[PDB]
Amino acid sequence: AVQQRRSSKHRRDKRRSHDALTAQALSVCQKCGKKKLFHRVCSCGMYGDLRVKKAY
Amino acid sequence: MVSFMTRLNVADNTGAKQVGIIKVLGSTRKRYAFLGDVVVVSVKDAIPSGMVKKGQVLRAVIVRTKKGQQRKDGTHLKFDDNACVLIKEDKSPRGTRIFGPVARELRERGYNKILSLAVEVV
Amino acid sequence: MEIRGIFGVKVGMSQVFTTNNERLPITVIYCEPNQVAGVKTEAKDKYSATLLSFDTVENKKLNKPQQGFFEKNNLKPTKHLQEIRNMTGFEMGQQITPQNLFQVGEYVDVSAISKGRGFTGAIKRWNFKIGPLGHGAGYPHRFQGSVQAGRGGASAQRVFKGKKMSGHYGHEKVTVQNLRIVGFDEANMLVLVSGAIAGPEGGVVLIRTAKKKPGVVKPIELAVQTEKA
Amino acid sequence: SYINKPGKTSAWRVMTVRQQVSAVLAYGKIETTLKKAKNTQKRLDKLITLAKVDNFNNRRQVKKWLLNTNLFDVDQLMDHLFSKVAPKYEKTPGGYSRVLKLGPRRGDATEMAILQLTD
Amino acid sequence: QSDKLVYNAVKGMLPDNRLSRRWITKVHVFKGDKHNMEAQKPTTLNWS
Amino acid sequence: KINKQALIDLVEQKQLKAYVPEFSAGDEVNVAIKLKEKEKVRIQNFTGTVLRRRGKGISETFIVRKTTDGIPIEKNFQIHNPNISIELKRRGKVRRAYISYMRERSGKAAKIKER
RNA sequence: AGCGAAAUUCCUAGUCGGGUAAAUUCCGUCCCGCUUGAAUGGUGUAACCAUCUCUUGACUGUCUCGGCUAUAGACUCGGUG
RNA sequence: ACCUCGAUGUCGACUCAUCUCAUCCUCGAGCUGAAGCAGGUUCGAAGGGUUCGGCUGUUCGCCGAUUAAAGAGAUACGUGAGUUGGGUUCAAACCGUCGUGAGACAGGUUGGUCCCUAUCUAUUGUGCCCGUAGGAAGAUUGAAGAGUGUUGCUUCUAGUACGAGAGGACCGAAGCGAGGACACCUCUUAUGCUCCAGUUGUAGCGCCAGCUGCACCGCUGGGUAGUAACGUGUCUAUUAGAUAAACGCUGAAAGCAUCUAAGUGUGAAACUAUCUCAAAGAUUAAUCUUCCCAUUUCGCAAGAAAGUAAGAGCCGUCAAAGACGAUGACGUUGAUAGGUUACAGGUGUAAGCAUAGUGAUAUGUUGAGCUGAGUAAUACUAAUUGCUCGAGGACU
């Protein structure tokens, strides 16, 4: 169904301002640069186990 | 489990052939049937080879249900045959011999000569 | 009445043949012995309660404030502690066993978690009725249930507060009373209790005195003939 | 539900698992979604445990979950794996392969994971 | 409980504002005799 | 605390018979049942075969189907119940456990047994 | 003449019988026939009607008495929207 | 005719019921041309329930079957943004009738379509911010509450009293109960869709055998865990305060007396204490507790820099949990999930070898084949040495 009026800016912001983003995990690399997410492979290959991957 | 409206035979020499369950006596919402219980029935087929005629509403006793039930003593009695009996408000029905098995639940309510007369007592 | 009891956890459930060789639904429960942390007596803490400690763990995985309080009370290291209000007090630090707490035939109450059903409808969370779907089904037959005490300008035109609606069901501890004590065992803090236990898997049960009566003990045990032939 | 993407039932699930295990055995490593990667790794561990013991019965049992791929025919796959991969991991109890988290793909922007083996 | 009865009476004799409920908060009436503001030297009066 | 969950054997030992002749789905067996009515000690004899046998130690139950003068009656007993006197009669060729086609067949069509 | 409460009849829940445990179903018997009527046919007729019912067999998740799973979304993620 | 004729879904059935008593039973009591049984009359009082099959466009209306009873009134004549459309009142047509006739009967019938992706008040659960006032967290209290407070049968006591005679009581206890709230899949049933055995056709794999896809997850039989019932397991309370009907004892008014005007017990399924738990943002922000450090000092006591250790969040192994959040543990200080291993269970002698059978087939092989989730030890894999904020008691 629908009402007989419109929804102003304030109602939307009360809906939108609580849709705001949040923070994330982080992982400083202990052997290289290219700071990466936690529990994620750094973007320069050399990972803890080994260079499980590449830089690109 | 054993809901009503299930035509079944008899267990003694009464002349009747078929009979159906109609209603639960006293408190409603029972919705099911158990062995050795008195329930009001509506006869479905009764040829004049005995005394029962079609169109009679009385309380018959069912003793066999193919679905079976769990007796709380630790005996899961499940039958494979269906029959009932009609008692004249005492320990003896109209038939001379009692055919078919009979449960022992109907013991503290009396009716032991029927057990001694029926083919099987379980 | 006098309040005593112990904790417990579900370690299984099966059938047990008690006296008269009849089957009884018996649940085996590992009771957790409680080491008393003291008594919060009234006129001293205003709510009488026997402080029980539980979940015995090691030291290196302990929290500094909880560890400091535990050492200040000098109570032996257990991970968690809780009070039981109006429970008969005991000395700080002792052996609590259901064999000495109660008799083998008393009446007790239990408190066990339930299953998490996730989001669940009324018919499975409040057990309402579902009508026939024959002679045409079409639209959803089970969404919320139709109520009309409000219609027009002023009859109610709104729903009363507390109308059971959308939400999660289960995953909540339920307290049941008047359950018999069945069997005494102390090999591995095991007990036997009649009935069906609340909890889908690995439920935790709080057991205290039943509040309909202190629990009249009656002689019931197990009967069996372990024979070789 | 009428005409649409028809089905993603467990039949397609196990079919995709078979395709992915065939691929990873054909290339020693595969990069896919972690959710599918873990189910693939379970099936891979079961296959490896089956391939530890070798016999015509064991070969028949192994030949129920593999298909022909490029750069490695099904017979070539079986030959290569039973020659080197199975004896190599026959000393480590459990935890055969290693699964590691990758970045998001460009298409769906969904998480990928790399499964590595043949040490 | 009888102090809450006086609370209800005075709240029914006050003009309905935020100041009214704050005045309600500014009243410490209890059935007992042991309280805390008696240490602040409360000037005894009656019907003010 | 970690529990081995082997307490099932511990609760069995307080309800176990020491001989307990076992059976599989497809073996005929007669069961003697002593009943203490205090006036007529009926040794109930239930003959037939076990249709399904539940295991897992203490939950061991089994349904036996008797045909008393053409009256088929299938009754589910339990292994650990007291007063149970199972006497093994003969053992047959166990084709498939949980025999469901034996709950619908009758005499003159039974399976072979071993003396 | 015929048929006559029916799709037609107001007195109706038409009399009565059958069946139905139980008939505001139906079919037969008398004939509440303002408005019974003979080619806007009076009676019925073999076969048939995606014709209208009435009863049963067999049968079932329609009820008793609802539960599991799968797809499809609803939930999240990314793109339009 | 006051607006809703610049749209009022306004029946029945189903679900949910709720509200009131003029409660019907049910509770108790008084009166009674009321021996008992069995009644009637009057009174207060709602805790639960107040049945079912059938026909009917129908709850109606009626028939029949049950209890101590089968209630009444209400919600645009409860419930079409909840459902159907069962139909007077469509269009199509018929029956009988009427109208000269288009058509109609305040008559019946054949057949027939009643939408909505929720903006908000309302409603229910879950989440982030901070208050909460030194922070953080455990135990809690409890201000206000909710759920629930239902009912019968039989026997012993008793064929006892009762009239005399048939007949035959309330209640003390007991069991039997119904019905529902609740528990789980413990045994029975159901389920089990990556679980297997039997199992045909095509397609392939040089071929038999054997494997796989599809052919209803080709199908039938089952079953691990979970999840339900058709399964059995707790309860149907007691107590107290004031109690209604309803008697009181004393006693005046009004020199006897009299529940009442003073004082004084009783007594209803009614109300609340009492049972089940939620329940301080309960701004009435409630209590205790421990840890944190007080590591200087321009400025408004530790940000002008040292900025918790109390923790808290992110991430992951995960799982009672599970839309996300949150939920609980674990995170290299290492057993938190998966396994590795052995076991339960079945799937019930796998393949294959050997023997006899032309062949099907008959025996050791061998409980063999394996196990989604079942039982337990398990660095073997994954859980990063990872990121962020985070104190000086802020003021009496």
With tokens 């992915």, the residue in question is D20
Chains F and E are touching, with contact defined as 3 or more CB–CB pairs separated by less than 8 Å: no
Whole-number Cα distances in Å, F1 to C53, C54, C208, D111, F5: 15, 11, 22, 38, 12
Q: Domain count of chain D?
A: 1
Q: Å from C160 (CA) to H3 (C1')?
A: 29
Chains C and D are touching, with contact defined as 3 or more CB–CB pairs separated by less than 8 Å: no
Q: Does residue B100 belong to the interface with chain F, where contact is any CB pair within 8 Å?
A: yes
Buried residues in D91-117 as b, exposed as e (16+ CB within 10 A): eeeeebbeebbbbeeeeeeebbbbbbb
The type of residue at C213 is K
With tokens 């040490």, the residue in question is D119
Q: Are B79 and B42 in contact (CB under 8 A)?
A: no
- To the nearest whole angstrom, how far is the Cα of F40 from the nearest Cα of chain B? 13
Q: What angle is formed at CA A51 by the lines to CA A46 and CA A55, rounded to 5 degrees?
A: 65
Closest CA to F41 of F49, F32, F50: F32
Closest CA to F68 of E8, C152, B102, E24: B102
Q: Does residue B31 belong to the interface with chain C, where contact is any CB pair within 8 Å?
A: no
Q: What is the resolution in angstroms?
A: 9.9
Of C21, C222, C229, the CB nearest to F81: C21
Q: Å from C153 (CA) to H3 (C1')?
A: 13
Query: Most distant CA pair in chain D: distance in Å?
Result: 52
What is the DSSP annotation of D53-74?
A: S-SHHHHHHHTTS----SSS-H
Nearest residue on chain A to D115, alpha-carbon basis: A52
Whole-number Cα distances in Å, C101 to A8, C31, C50, C96, F49: 66, 12, 14, 7, 48
The type of residue at C141 is H
Structure obtained using: cryo-EM
Domain encompassing residue D88: 1-119
Q: Are A36 and A42 in contact (CB under 8 A)?
A: yes
Could you check: is the Cβ of residue D109 within 7 Å of any atom of nucleic acid strand G?
yes
3-state per-residue secondary structure call for chain F:
CCCCCCHHHHHHHCCCCCCCCCCCCCCEEEEEEECCCCCCCCEEEEEEEEEEECCCCCCCEEEEEEEECCEEEEEEEECCCCCEEEEECCEECCCCCCCCHHHCCCCCCCCCEEC
Nearest residue on chain F to B101, alpha-carbon basis: F71
φ, ψ of residue B80 in degrees (nearest 5): -130, 10
Could you check: is the Cβ of residue C132 within 7 Å of any atom of nucleic acid strand G?
yes
Could you check: is the Cβ of residue D100 within 7 Å of any atom of nucleic acid strand H?
yes
